[PDB]
């Protein structure tokens, strides 16, 4: 009988995972601050990693990687890509980006490469005239970052509409990197306007902001079945060749970059984590990394399969019980 605790009640993914564990009959849930647990499904912020792995007779595992925040904050990711030689300023697949504080950063060198196609992004806002946006941040109290907005996105037909791709990746205690074979396109429901940019409607792809200010596919979510079919019929390529290889590459690069810093290989507790990578595909079927989310939600149709895969690969490999849905990315 394995034991676990729940310290993030807000998570929908690990809601399902705890459901799946209790239903096995070889797990039992404890009170939140009962220390004698095998598994911790931890809080999103200020997780006490310092207190893990000091329980004699307990092998302990936690669903987060300490230090992975450096990949899952925008400021931190820019910083990590610009100063990490594994990724380099020679990084073909991340949009030009600068970190800026509201009046150790680079507010200066932002305008320097400016006055040399000038359209950028910054509760958001887009523009081509820098001077104004730099006040948008000034007003606000958080460190905002700015990057070149992608002028020419790949636009779906029928509709002339832009999208982003979300892929789900699982990294286990051995630092095997597993890509869920199912990803999702979060689509814009209304057409794409190249003219005046400052309208948060057909440029922002995120889900909730389209259940509001906005048919073709259900819930503006198109799955790999569909999108692969489209690519074959309109562009005569496959999802795999024109896109996934680039996505598999970027994922490999990012997570191998930080492995030395967060690996729990020789540590007294073990970590695994679920990431949500978000990408953009442009006109030339070139793929771009937008953000890495450390506490991702899952698409509704898929919860059952993904959460099942989490128990199989991340949890039960450490805690055995009584084809695969992932693509192992080798290294």
């Amino acid at each position: 009988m394995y034991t676990f605790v729940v310290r993030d009640e807000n998570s929908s993914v690990y809601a399902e995972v705890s459901r799946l564990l209790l239903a096995t009959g070889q797990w039992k849930r404890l009170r939140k601050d009962n220390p004698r647990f095998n598994l911790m499904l931890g809080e999103r912020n200020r997780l006490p990693f310092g207190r893990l792995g000091h329980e004699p007779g307990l092998v302990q595992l936690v669903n987060y990687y300490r230090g992975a925040d450096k990949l899952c904050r925008k400021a931190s990711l820019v910083k990590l890509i610009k100063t990490s030689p594994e990724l380099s300023e020679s990084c073909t697949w991340f949009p030009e980006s600068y970190v800026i504080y509201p009046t150790t950063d680079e507010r200066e060198v932002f305008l320097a490469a400016y006055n040399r196609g000038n359209v950028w992004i910054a509760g958001i806002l887009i523009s081509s005239e820098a001077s104004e946006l730099l006040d948008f941040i000034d007003e606000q109290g958080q460190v905002h970052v700015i990057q070149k907005y992608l002028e020419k996105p790949l636009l779906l037909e029928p509709g002339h509409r832009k999208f982003d791709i979300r892929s789900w990746v699982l990294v286990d205690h051995l630092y095997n990197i597993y890509l869920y074979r199912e990803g999702v396109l979060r689509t814009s429901s209304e057409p794409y306007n190249s003219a005046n940019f400052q309208d948060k409607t057909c440029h922002l792809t995120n889900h909730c902001i389209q259940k509001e200010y906005s048919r073709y596919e259900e819930g503006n979510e198109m799955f790999f079945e569909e999108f692969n079919q489209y690519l074959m019929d309109a562009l005569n390529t496959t999802l795999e060749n024109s896109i996934l290889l680039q996505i598999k590459h970027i994922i490999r690069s990012c997570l191998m970059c930080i492995e030395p810093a967060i690996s729990t290989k020789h540590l007294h507790y073990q970590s695994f984590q679920l990431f949500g990578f978000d990408f953009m595909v442009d006109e030339e079927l070139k793929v771009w990394l937008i953000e890495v989310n450390g506490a991702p939600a899952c698409a509704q149709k898929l919860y059952a399969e993904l959460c099942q895969g989490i128990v199989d690969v991340a949890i039960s490999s450490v805690f055995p019980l009584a084809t695969s849905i992932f693509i192992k990315l080798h290294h």
Partner: protein, 439 residues
């Protein structure tokens, strides 16, 4: 030449002290009866080793040490041990009943009946010094005497020796070998009260030593004897520069200079390598690069924590045996690329290094294999704060229900010293946090 006096307090301090003093003797060629044939100046000296041993006209080299425990059992062993002739009766002090794992009893009640005696014995050794540099103090966090008496002593020592350095060797409590549920209480009380009086304290988590013993020595259920022989190796590595010819860490003050920029943050992490089983039918001997790299493995730390997620303020490498600077410098640049080693901005990313050619001395019949080369790293990293977080959370769990508090109050302590002590530790956790937050 300038002397140091060692003070061993409570059971942990005393048994560790016997391990260290036994190990010192084997390193300097001092026999159990106190005779040191190698020593050609009889009845006196200003050699480096004289910092730890005084001499008699009869050729006796006797430790500059005092042992103090509120109960006689443990020190009685010393009084009858194989090194009984080493010490003279005046430096072995005992009481009748102990502090019963109660800090208040060690500090206030039973402490007051013995503090002036201890200080008088300490005065006697001090007067025999031509240039006393200060004190090394050995004790547990968890015992009544180790926690309560020690903090009493430490305060009095600042009064009677306002200008001397005080170093600590502190045993931090682990359930696997601990003996009171109340040890987190005692740990936070003594840390609070001793903090302003200690220049530099080396913390040893029994948990860390227990597991190094299990894993690297093949000891299924480590005893204190096992733990203590390993601890004396680390202690010896740390004090070697005081007892031998050299130019690094040659006086007590230099420990603080090299390791402690911030007074309150005076808890260096020690990491030791290599630890190899003597029952092992020969181990492929490790290189400079290999034992140096091992210094950045949590599993070889005196405290389990993760220095990756903190910053360094200072780092010293102490080698014993077959080591020359070139192989060291070449071990470092390799590591500096393989590992994430982040010093604070207001700090040079760098290592002070010390090599002593005498390889580690091991106790005959002990568990440790002899090796041609070893290293002890002392790194002041913010990561050690993890052990304060652990300790403080256990304190909070019990204190919220006032569990066991009546035992302290019954000894004359006020509830207020609990909260005050915890608040001080809350401030100490925040100081570490400030110092280590690029991320």
């Amino acid at each position: 030449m300038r002397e140091c006096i060692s003070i061993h307090v409570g059971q942990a301090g005393v048994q560790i002290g016997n391990a260290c003093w036994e190990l010192y003797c084997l390193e300097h060629g001092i026999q159990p009866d106190g005779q040191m044939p190698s020593d050609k100046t009889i009845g006196g000296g200003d050699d480096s080793f004289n910092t730890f041993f005084s001499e008699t006209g009869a050729g006796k080299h006797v430790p500059r040490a005092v042992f103090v425990d509120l109960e006689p059992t443990v020190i009685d062993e010393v009084r009858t041990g194989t090194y009984r002739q080493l010490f003279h009766p005046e430096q072995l002090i005992t009481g009748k009943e102990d502090a019963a794992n109660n800090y208040a009893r060690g500090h206030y009640t039973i402490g007051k009946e013995i503090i002036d005696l201890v200080l008088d014995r300490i005065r006697k050794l001090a007067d025999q010094c031509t240039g006393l540099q200060g004190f090394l103090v050995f004790h547990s966090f968890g015992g009544g005497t180790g926690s309560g008496f020690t903090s009493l002593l430490m305060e009095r020592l600042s009064v009677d020796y306002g200008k001397k350095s005080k170093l600590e060797f502190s045993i931090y409590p682990a359930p696997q070998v601990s003996t009171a549920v109340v040890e987190p209480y005692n740990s936070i009380l003594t840390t609070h009260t001793t903090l302003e009086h200690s220049d530099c304290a080396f913390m040893v988590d029994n948990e860390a030593i227990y597991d190094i013993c299990r894993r690297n020595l093949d000891i299924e259920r480590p005893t204190y004897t096992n733990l203590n022989r390993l601890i004396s190796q680390i202690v010896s590595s740390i004090t070697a520069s005081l007892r031998f010819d050299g130019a690094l860490n040659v006086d007590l003050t230099e420990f603080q200079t090299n390791l402690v920029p911030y007074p309150r943050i005076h808890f260096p992490l020690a990491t030791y390598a290599p630890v190899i089983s003597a029952e092992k039918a020969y181990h492929e001997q490790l290189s400079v690069a290999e034992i140096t790299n091992a210094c950045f493995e949590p599993a070889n730390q005196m405290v389990k924590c993760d220095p990756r997620h903190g910053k360094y303020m200072a780092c010293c490498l102490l080698y014993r045996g077959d080591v020359v600077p070139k192989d060291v410098n070449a071990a470092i640049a390799t590591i500096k690329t393989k590992r994430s080693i982040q010093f604070v901005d207001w700090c040079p990313t760098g290592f002070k290094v010390g090599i002593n050619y005498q390889p580690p001395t091991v106790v005959p019949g002990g568990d440790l294999a002899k090796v041609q080369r070893a290293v002890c790293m002392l790194s002041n990293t913010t990561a050690i704060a993890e052990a304060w977080a652990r300790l403080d959370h256990k304190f909070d769990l019990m204190y919220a229900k006032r569990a066991f508090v009546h035992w302290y109050v019954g000894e004359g302590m006020e509830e207020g010293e609990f909260s005050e002590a915890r608040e001080d530790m809350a401030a100490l956790e925040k100081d570490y946090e400030e110092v280590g937050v690029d991320s």
